[PDB]
């Protein structure tokens, strides 16, 4: 299935 | 520029720099030497960088398991122990700072991770890590969770992925063959997919890190820890009542903690060698200055005989022992630092499900080996390695190149390892060397394919797959448009890892839907891109890396 949880760190200003 | 005529030493916050300042003073009481402690975050990575120039701390205290690296790199100054102060430490501790055949830093104390117990919440700890599962169940039910240790940094984790096989070097007849490691093998595999099992199941959290972890234990929301005898001075402060136990066991076999030996170092640019030693031997290797120290942050099973005899009837120092016996020496060779980062990716991409455990174990091997054997020395020889060994995998399937079933799975590779070592030397993934590779991929394996989208004639995950197609999909039309597409100054196309950008003007806050790749992303929110007057993208002001704003989307 998809993914249940965004990586944190990705969404963070370290992230994409 | 190192300034004679003092000292300044480095050692990681959580170890007693007080205690160590202590030592200082006493020092300076008698020398007139000046001794300044500080505790520099990331010292293990800050040390070679300013040491590289001839500058930084004139001592270093780390774990053994780093200086064999420094020692490579010229960082260290030979140590002198005369046969009389050697005789006072325990031979094994002399061993973990032995490297090629030279005493490379002085020994202080024995570190291991034991499992540290709530005994009010919790009155006999498990002795299984597969009974940990039912009785998170029954604490939550009470408002409390069974286990929380740092997911963050891989000593945590690796006493689980060692005890059903997992292993760093094979160690044999004295040496260590770096082509021989352990990290993708079953016992590495089932150790790894025991602890994202407990994090899928929601008995752990994969962003807890050691503060989160230090307080939820010391404010009695949770009622077990894993951590080293330094913990004990904070546990001590909360008036938890804890128990510091053997680790449990997995598939019936003991955990398997890598055992540091807290060492020192003197710095090879130091004009203060001698005032070094000094302070060394004759302050802090004595009863009274590691006392000092132990006072402060607990040391464990100090290096020194005499005062380690003293200490030795500690329950919690027997406890650490025993764990230090169940568990390996880390080697101290060159190659830790690279192998340290790669099981740190590995823990961190399969908690947060950005690898599978199977991916993320063998990326781990791949890209460390990569390292291990002097190829890789760079973001550029990097990039190479990930083409090389992209190329190797699309040659034999040639005819395949537009089947989405035969090249997703080497495509995925490439990107997860220029991922894998833009982090390792500090670059934002994406950037501009990696957008070339990416494009020259396009150009010579994809460029007959008749679709912008993938077609098809153990697949990726859903979610894996649903990003990868849409990378894809960027680099088959926008990012191959040969003409710029916004008129004047404008942010060049870009795809930022989850979504594609066109080139936008300049002054312009760009904005799309939410890509749907996560349960927790509404895809009715906005994703926002920040083109500056300049025409460069926004830089998030904490990083300084080129950053999509994605926050919108999981609120
Ligand atoms: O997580 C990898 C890290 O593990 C060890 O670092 C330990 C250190 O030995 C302890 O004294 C304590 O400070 O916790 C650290 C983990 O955060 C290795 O010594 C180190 O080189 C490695 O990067
Ligand atoms: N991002």
């Not at chain 2, 090629?100 to 540290?116: D, M, R, T």
């Not at chain 2, 945590?156 to 070097?169: K, V």
């Not at chain 2, 099981?343 to 908690?351: E, G, K, L, P, Q």
Request: overall charge negative.
């Amino acid at each position: 299935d998809k993914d249940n949880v965004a990586p944190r760190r990705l969404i963070g200003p370290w992230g994409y | 520029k190192i300034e004679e005529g003092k000292l300044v030493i480095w050692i990681n916050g959580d170890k007693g720099y007080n205690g160590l300042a202590e030592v200082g003073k006493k020092f300076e009481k008698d020398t007139g030497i000046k001794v300044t402690v500080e505790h520099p975050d990331k010292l293990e990575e800050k040390f070679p960088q300013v040491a590289a120039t001839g500058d930084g701390p004139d001592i270093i205290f780390w774990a053994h398991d780093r200086f064999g690296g420094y020692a490579q790199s010229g960082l260290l100054a030979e140590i002198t122990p005369d046969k009389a102060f050697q005789d006072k430490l325990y031979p094994f501790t002399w061993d973990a700072v032995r490297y090629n055949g030279k005493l490379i830093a002085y020994p202080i104390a024995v570190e291991a991770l034991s499992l540290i117990y709530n005994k009010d919440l919790l009155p006999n700890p498990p002795k299984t890590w597969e009974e940990i599962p039912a009785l998170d169940k029954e604490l939550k039910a009470k408002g409390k969770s069974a286990l929380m240790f740092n997911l963050q940094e891989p000593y945590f984790t690796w006493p689980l992925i060692a005890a059903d096989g997992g292993y760093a070097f094979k160690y044999e007849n004295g040496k260590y063959d770096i082509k021989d490691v352990g990290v993708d093998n079953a016992g590495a595999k089932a150790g790894l997919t025991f602890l994202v099992d407990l994090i899928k199941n929601k008995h752990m959290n994969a962003d807890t890190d050691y503060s989160i972890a230090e307080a939820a234990f010391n404010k009695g929301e949770t009622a077990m820890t894993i951590n080293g005898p330094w913990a004990w001075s904070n546990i001590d402060t909360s008036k938890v009542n804890y128990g510091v136990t053997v680790l449990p066991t997995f598939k019936g076999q003991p955990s398997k903690p890598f055992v540091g030996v807290l060492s020192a170092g003197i710095n090879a640019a130091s004009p203060n060698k001698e005032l070094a030693k000094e302070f060394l031997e004759n302050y802090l290797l004595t009863d009274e200055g590691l006392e000092a120290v132990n006072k402060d942050k607990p040391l464990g099973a100090v290096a020194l005989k005499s005062y380690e005899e003293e200490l030795a009837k500690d329950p919690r120092i027997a406890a650490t022992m025993e764990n230090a016996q169940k568990g390996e020496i880390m080697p101290n060779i060159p190659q830790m630092s690279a192998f340290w980062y790669a099981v740190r990716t590995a823990v961190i991409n399969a908690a947060s499900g950005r690898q599978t455990v199977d991916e993320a174990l063998k990326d781990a091997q791949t890209n460390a080996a990569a390292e291990f054997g002097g190829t890789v020395k760079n973001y550029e020889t990097a990039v190479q390695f990930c083409w090389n060994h992209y190329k190797d995998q699309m040659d034999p399937i040639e005819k395949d190149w537009c089947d989405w079933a035969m090249i997703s799975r080497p495509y995925s590779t490439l990107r997860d390892c220029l991922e894998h070592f833009a982090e390792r030397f500090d670059l934002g993934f994406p950037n501009p060397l990696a957008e070339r590779i990416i494009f020259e991929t396009h150009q010579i394996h994809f460029a007959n394919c008749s679709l912008v989208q993938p077609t098809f004639s153990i697949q990726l995950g859903v979610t894996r797959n649903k990003i990868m197609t849409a990378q894809y999909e960027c680099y088959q039309k926008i990012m191959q448009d040969p003409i710029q597409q916004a008129e004047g100054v404008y942010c060049n196309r870009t795809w930022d890892g989850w979504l594609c950008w066109n080139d936008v003007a300049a002054g312009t806050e760009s904005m799309q839907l939410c890509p749907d790749y996560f349960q927790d992303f509404d895809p009715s929110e906005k994703v926002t891109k920040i083109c500056d007057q300049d025409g460069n993208w926004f830089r998030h002001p904490a990083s300084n890396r080129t950053w999509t704003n994605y926050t919108q989307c999981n609120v």
